[PDB]
Amino acid sequence: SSKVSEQLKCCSGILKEMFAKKHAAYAWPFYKPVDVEALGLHDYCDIIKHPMDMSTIKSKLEAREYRDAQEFGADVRLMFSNCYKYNPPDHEVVAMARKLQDVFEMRFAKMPD
Ligand SMILES: CC(=O)N1CCN(Cc2cccc(C)c2)c2ccccc21
């Protein structure tokens, strides 16, 4: 029963939506950590210093590792920025990231006061 605890509940709701069937078409690459053993991803860890994904953010929320919504937000944006940094700007996964980020940014912006 506080301002910060209510906003963190909203964050959990936002992430739940991101995991929903509704967005699955473009959200799926962000579900689990980038598999750096996959062909073509041998250099991922050379380029991406701080990997992030939605399962990791979910575990961090559930282990209460986010002091506030801004910290949760930073991890969501890290995930997207990693995608934009690593992949070629014309790769389909970049388009998918933008589609999911549009969902996130709209919900995050309209979090209650
Ligand atoms: C999020 C991210 O940077 N990557 C790396 C590129 N990809 C590879 C890839 C290949 C075809 C279609 C798509 C949408 C994606 C990928 C795949 C599964 C999980 C993560 C990623």
DSSP state of 23: G
Burial class (CB in 10 A: 0-12, 13-18, 19+), 99: middle
| CA–CA dist 45, 85 (Å, integer) | 12
| Technique behind the model | X-ray
- SS3 of 19, please? coil
Query: 11 CA to middle of ligand 1, Å?
Result: 24
Identify the residue whose C-alpha is closest to ligand 1 atom 2. Answer: 83
State whether the beta carbon of 102 lies less than 6 angstroms from ligand 1: no
How many angstroms separate the CA atoms of 86 and 88, rounded?
Answer: 7
Specify whether the CB–CB gap between 32 and 53 falls below 8 A.
yes
83: Cβ contacts below 8 Å, ≥ 6 apart: 29, 30, 93, 94, 97
In angstroms, what is the span from residue 61 Cα to ligand 1's centroid?
Answer: 24
Closest Cα to atom 3 of ligand 1: 83
- Residue 43 and residue 77: Cα distance in Å, rounded? 21
CATH number, domain 1-113, options 1.10.760.10, 3.40.720.10, 3.10.450.50, 1.20.920.10:
1.20.920.10
Instruction: Delimit the domains of the chain by residue range.
Output: 1-113
Provide the token pair at 110.
């309209």
Question: Alpha helices, DSSP H only, in 2-91?
Answer: 3-18, 24-27, 44-47, 54-62, 69-86
